[PDB]
């Protein structure tokens, strides 16, 4: 790895600089290098890893959606067929996206998840595993779409089981996991009723626990609660 000669602390320092510079491909490479040092990650470091790769894959997902839409339009009765280029370039972006997802899943499997024993770290990583299988599912078609969906579901479910046992219903890790699992149900798994039920129960149980929170924690929890509400408004 090209980051193998750099100090762990230097990699984290540069990841933060890259964040400030909006250089998210660099940020992701720095954080991959930090993970590959083999030590567990702190909360701040886990967040840097997530911010970096979410921004990278987010650009890829947006581009893939643009190209897929153009491709679908080109494949309609009455469209002047324009050769293989749209498909080729959509496939190029898709392969790069799948590569980023495989890289993140590889870091989780070797060996972030198995060394994560505290609930806050383990739930975070299992949610990430669900998320990156979900991004793979967004572009999957053939035989393996079913298996990718099941892998996402399994990771989210393990994370949910731990979060419900070990975290209060306002915990922002737990809330964002439930948010993303509800998105999985609506957008990937063709289960809008499950999505709505999960979003509603999550919201209501968090509402009832807000009285226990400080001002700052209340702001964190209610921000995610608003996203649950936004989706429920979209969905109903």
């Amino acid at each position: 790895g090209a980051m193998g000669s750099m100090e762990r602390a230097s990699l984290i320092q540069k990841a933060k600089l890259a964040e400030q510079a909006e250089r998210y491909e660099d940020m992701a490479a720095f954080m991959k290098g930090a993970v590959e040092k083999g030590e567990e990650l702190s909360c701040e470091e886990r967040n840097l890893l997530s911010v970096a790769y979410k921004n990278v894959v987010g650009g890829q997902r947006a581009a893939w959606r643009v190209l897929s839409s153009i491709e679908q339009k080109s494949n309609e009765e009455g469209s002047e067929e324009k050769g293989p280029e749209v498909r080729e370039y959509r496939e190029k972006v898709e392969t790069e996206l799948q590569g980023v997802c495989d890289t993140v899943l590889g870091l989780l499997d070797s060996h972030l998840i198995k060394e994560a024993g505290d609930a806050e770290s383990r739930v975070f990583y299992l949610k990430m595993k669900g998320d990156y299988y979900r991004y793979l599912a967004e572009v999957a078609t053939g035989d393996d779409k079913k298996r990718i969906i099941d892998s996402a579901r399994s990771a989210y479910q393990e994370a949910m089981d731990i979060s419900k046992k070990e975290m209060p219903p306002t915990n922002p890790i737990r809330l964002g996991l439930a948010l993303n699992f509800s998105v999985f149900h609506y957008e990937i798994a063709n289960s809008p009723e499950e999505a709505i039920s999960l979003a509603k129960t999550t919201f209501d149980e968090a509402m009832a626990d807000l009285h226990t929170l400080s001002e700052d924690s209340y702001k964190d929890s209610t921000l995610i609660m608003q996203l649950l509400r936004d989706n429920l408004t979209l969905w109903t």
């Binding site: 967040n47 911010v51 964002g176 948010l179 998105v183 996203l227 936004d230 979209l234």
Partner: peptide
């Protein structure tokens, strides 16, 4: 419009 997932938080 697509559903909203957890955003990044600096």
């Amino acid at each position: 419009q697509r559903s909203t997932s957890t955003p990044n938080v600096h």
